[PDB]
Amino acid sequence: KVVATDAYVTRTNIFYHASSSRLLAVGHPYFSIKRANKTVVPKVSGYQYRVFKVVLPDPNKFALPDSSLFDPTTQRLVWACTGLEVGRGQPLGVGVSGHPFLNKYDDVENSGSGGNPGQDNRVNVGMDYKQTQLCMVGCAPPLGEHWGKGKQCTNTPVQAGDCPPLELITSVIQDGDMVDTGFGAMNFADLQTNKSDVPIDICGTTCKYPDYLQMAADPYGDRLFFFLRKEQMFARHFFNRAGEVGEPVPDTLIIKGSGNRTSVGSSIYVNTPSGSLVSSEAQLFNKPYWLQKAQGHNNGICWGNQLFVTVVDTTRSTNMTLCASVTTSSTYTNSDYKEYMRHVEEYDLQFIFQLCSITLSAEVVAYIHTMNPSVLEDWNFPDPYKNLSFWEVNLKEKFSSELDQYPLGRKFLLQS
Amino acid sequence: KVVATDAYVTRTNIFYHASSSRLLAVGHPYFSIKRANKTVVPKVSGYQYRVFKVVLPDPNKFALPDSSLFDPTTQRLVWACTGLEVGRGQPLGVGVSGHPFLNKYDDVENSGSGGNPGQDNRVNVGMDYKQTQLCMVGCAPPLGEHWGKGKQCTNTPVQAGDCPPLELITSVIQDGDMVDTGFGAMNFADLQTNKSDVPIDICGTTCKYPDYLQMAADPYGDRLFFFLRKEQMFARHFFNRAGEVGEPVPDTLIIKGSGNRTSVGSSIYVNTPSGSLVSSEAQLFNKPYWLQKAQGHNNGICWGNQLFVTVVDTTRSTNMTLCASVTTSSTYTNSDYKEYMRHVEEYDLQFIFQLCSITLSAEVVAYIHTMNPSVLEDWNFPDPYKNLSFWEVNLKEKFSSELDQYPLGRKFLLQS
Amino acid sequence: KVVATDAYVTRTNIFYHASSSRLLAVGHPYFSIKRANKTVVPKVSGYQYRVFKVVLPDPNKFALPDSSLFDPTTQRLVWACTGLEVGRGQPLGVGVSGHPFLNKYDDVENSGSGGNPGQDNRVNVGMDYKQTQLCMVGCAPPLGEHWGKGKQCTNTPVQAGDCPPLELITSVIQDGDMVDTGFGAMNFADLQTNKSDVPIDICGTTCKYPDYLQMAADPYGDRLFFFLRKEQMFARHFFNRAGEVGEPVPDTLIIKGSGNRTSVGSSIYVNTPSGSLVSSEAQLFNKPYWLQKAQGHNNGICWGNQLFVTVVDTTRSTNMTLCASVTTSSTYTNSDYKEYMRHVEEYDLQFIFQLCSITLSAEVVAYIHTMNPSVLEDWNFPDPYKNLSFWEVNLKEKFSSELDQYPLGRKFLLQS
């Protein structure tokens, strides 16, 4: 019932290059800065999803060299993505996140400690996150999965303070969403009510992980033209949580003691992640990718003259430390200086598209009415994505037919 | 509009070898030594850019074997780089930098510590930097990028002690500039006013990172004939900064405590880098590289009879410790000895050039008037780089036509 | 002017095998043991150069099967090295060196420490060195480079206790010389007068590193038939030196404090090395090497009927601990036992040579008078190396024409 685009989308020899030029994002790696109402400094972190909404010029209204390529009736034009290079322009490095009141009790990796459960045992702890690189391309935004406070309730009926029901929520990955760290893809705002179990840059948001299985199993495959990924982490340190154990260890699994002791220690264990080594050999970016064959049926056809490119790059997450002097005392005094956190991201999106025509027979128009019907409406033969948030990359007025005048174009001529 | 050099630069069969012989740089790995006015011992560190300005003899005035190769009118000569080997002659190793008053408060990697914010909490801390290898070649100096105190100001209007505006500054990489370490490419002299947030060898200078995106996107491509790079690092330790937090954690993200505590700990986290293992298998140097095809349109043509070779090598950054005796007491007394820091760099630049002629038609002269016009002025058909500082490598009177008498020449005959 | 040996040295079909049998070196890994005048136990350490002087029988005086191969007049014979296998016969492992009075002040990697500068702050510290594997072959001994107290002086004129002038000294690598460790290639006896900055096994000697650049740039190339190398290390720990800072941190680089503090901490940082993992996959030895093509012009011709084979192997540096009982008290008492340090090295040098003849014309005799003139004098057509120290390997009376009777010979028949 669902057929590949190669059956009804004819390819041409017309290729175009389009570069987004340098794209810079400068902000705070932990939280947005609002004074007094709206944001003044945005939240820019290396562990954020960069979902670029690349807008392409309509080929049916494009200033083509000759209009004899197609007939205005029965035929329509659409762009097809054949080349891509996501350039990164920052030094490799690892950034750290932390929490001045992290719910850490005792370092459980080695031993300790006797009995000091009290009012507040939160400690100021910092850490580095898991290393994650990924990039996807499609004509529809990607799908992410995360565990959130589920609809109440499986079984019945009573509160309170009990464990919340878990539900795997599939959603659209927006630009600015947090990637997984070292604690899973979950909604920490709802599942961790103490605002102190994970570092401050994720304790009030949600970590989303790409739903590769769902996006690959969809019929048309408009969300995954291709994808590349590299995740790596190891267990840095171990510790236990402070507070009451909601579900204690059964009696059969622990022989109670002990004169002293007698109180079962906190058995809620969590480990800090670590991204380990970052290297140039492990880089996914700064090198071109040619969409020879797509995994889905959509073989790189940018329906609606748009292209969604998702990028996650934690290998350039270095957080710069700024220090401004309020005064200069005769001696060194900490009260004279203010410390600031700043992070930067540099991108250069380069694309190479192939012009394609579609002969609209009665069967083709029927097949295109199903699937996305707006494809026919925009062809003359409201956008539901205005509620989401993407990094708009306007590539209209950026298309060029002189391929050899650009780096990606030169690489295209000498390859494929 | 921009065409490759292969269209208007004809190749010959005449090849020449030129070696810089042994080049030695001995100095202090942390700072220059000035007594009393000018420097007596230079600052020589493995984490510095080595930008060699190789001066080539003018082939139009060269004592060629036969002048019948070209006509003095309508034709001019120019050198083309075809072979290169950057030889390093020191043992592999890692050097350390430090600061006797580094702005480190508490080791935040594990836990701690209660409440000791005071006048001066700076500690004597040392560390090793991120491992970075790179080498570039072009007929124009390379471009580096770094973050500096930006032009004031985006938004308005008031001081003081606030976070300084950030601006991505692209500049020319001079010989002696610092490569990125584990804290980004920034101007620490302006962005960190306490002179104590990073080790002493970078706290008063600027770390520059190559702007690969801009140099690759340049029309003529005079700055990137080719490049090789290898960067790697991991997070060694974590800590927080002392002093006032310029931007506090939002009220929404932390549940305030605590009887005691009540003061939110320092939430300015930065991690020390570490270059990890250095090995012979990871070396980029001591092996020849042949410029088969250039990424830009300039296919290795050394316009102006000069060649800029940039080199970064942190794999031989070992800092030697010297100890001189002032006296020899009966027992061992530290007051009898002076300790010194010394670092050395050994280079051997080997090149192999190809002679080329250019038929100067009306179109060729026109195309060469645009781009660099001095190419025509020097051909008889002020230097803006005298304000910068490069390692001058005079290869005039060093060209030889006997290729088999040199190592790189021997490798050239049996290869390519 | 300099031509390869392939032009004037004709090859034959006569091949010979020669094995040094088992070579054992047993001694002390730190220092030689002299009682009361001369050494009783030699210094045998895995970080020493093993420079074997292999003496070959004169082919002009050899009992060849038939003398009709060459004419006694106008022609002479010489051996050419075509096969080599350096067999190591000890378990892989890492040995440690140390110093009971090492000039280590504070562990500067993490933090600390306040203010304890005093008479003697030396600590008993041990460490493992950088892993280094290398092997070379030539008809002349190899050249090593190291930094020593240079000739005084560049600039003028006064003492005392100042930093000594540094000079890169090239010398001949003798059997027993120390390889670089983690503190560089320098003459610790002259540049470090306190006898306490590096462990005891290098603090009174000199660490030499091979000058690959000079030996490769040699015209005839008699010192490098070939070479193989593998170096690796990382930064284990960081610390600073005790004693007065000979070159203080410049004022412009530190903001003076602090009520307390006020005294700038020791800013002379040096890091302990570590050879990391040793594995069988990283071994260079126990496998044959065939000299197919030489980098220099000397294509494996053993002039003077001798061959210098240099070997460095730190992957078998395990130091055995011996414990001898002086008495046996009723209980355990440390005074009853003496602990000793012992290190061993097992080698098996295997060679396969090819007989070659040289037709001595007037031009050939002239070319051989220049270069090494003793080649003609010994042919009948004082040794300057008796002042140096090499491991004499007499392979006369060890040549055999039955190749299949030996391991390297069997590997030779089935290969090359």
Place this chain on the structure above:
Amino acid sequence: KVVATDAYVTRTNIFYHASSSRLLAVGHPYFSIKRANKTVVPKVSGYQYRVFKVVLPDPNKFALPDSSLFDPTTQRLVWACTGLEVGRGQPLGVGVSGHPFLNKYDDVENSGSGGNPGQDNRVNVGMDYKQTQLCMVGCAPPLGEHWGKGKQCTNTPVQAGDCPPLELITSVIQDGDMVDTGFGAMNFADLQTNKSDVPIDICGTTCKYPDYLQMAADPYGDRLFFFLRKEQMFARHFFNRAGEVGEPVPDTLIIKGSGNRTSVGSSIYVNTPSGSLVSSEAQLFNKPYWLQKAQGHNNGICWGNQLFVTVVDTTRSTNMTLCASVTTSSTYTNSDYKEYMRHVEEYDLQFIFQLCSITLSAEVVAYIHTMNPSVLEDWNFPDPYKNLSFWEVNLKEKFSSELDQYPLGRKFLLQS
């Protein structure tokens, strides 16, 4: 003089499969358990040599399908090994050894410690050994080398407590002998008289390392049909020995201090080994090996109808902990439980042999009289190995001609 078996041993087309089935060894990883006279629980450790003496049925008395293959006179039969797979059937893991009274004084890796030399400074310390995998095959038992108390004496003449003379002892590796661990191949029972310098599982025995050089240099090569090996380790921790320094540091190498200090610290350094990561990709076993070509002259001929298979596998050295309850008090009391150490090893030896005949001419009988003469005596044309200890693997009555009924046989049909 020595010729390969291919010259006088004719091959046939008859192949047989033989499997040892599952072989299990369960015991104590540290020491044998003797109550009261003889052993009740054997010493089973992952760091032991597994030397299997595989006994083959006599082909001259074997029930072959047809006796027309050979003539009973002038011809004899012998088995030849062509396929082998040593299957391991335990989970991968690392086991630890230790000593409740290990001769460890101060942790010398970092710093410390002042002055606490006393009666007994032994500490309870545990560690993991170096990872070692190896397997060998031959018709004669393998040769191991180790350093032992040498014959007295080189030079003369006196005791006591002095360093014992070292001698490289070559011996036969028996089943149960200890492999090298991290402290070399030596006889700890004789060279370390305090019974406290190494963990308990090697402090009273001898660690043997294979003498690859000698076994490869044997004329006939009956001991090394082939071998495979993988060794890896790194330096975990550093420390010094307690007790008297038998050979002190010379005065010339240390500047004596210091008011305090004055006593030179213990300069006998030794490092704990560590096998690092064990992985499935590094496994040598559970995969077949086909003896295509032998390194020696013996091309897999099992003289005497026997086959020696040596195996070392430390990747499955996990030591299981057993806990038996003597009583069950109301609370938890350590006096109620006994802790035990247990280690297991699972093997499955699979072989595939090729039947071979030998034409006994006058020269063949002479050549076989030399070498092993018992080969002719057993052919009718006491065992010196009964004093040693091997794992007897009786493969008589286990030969099968149906190759496809077994895993190794199936792999043989589809390979070689």
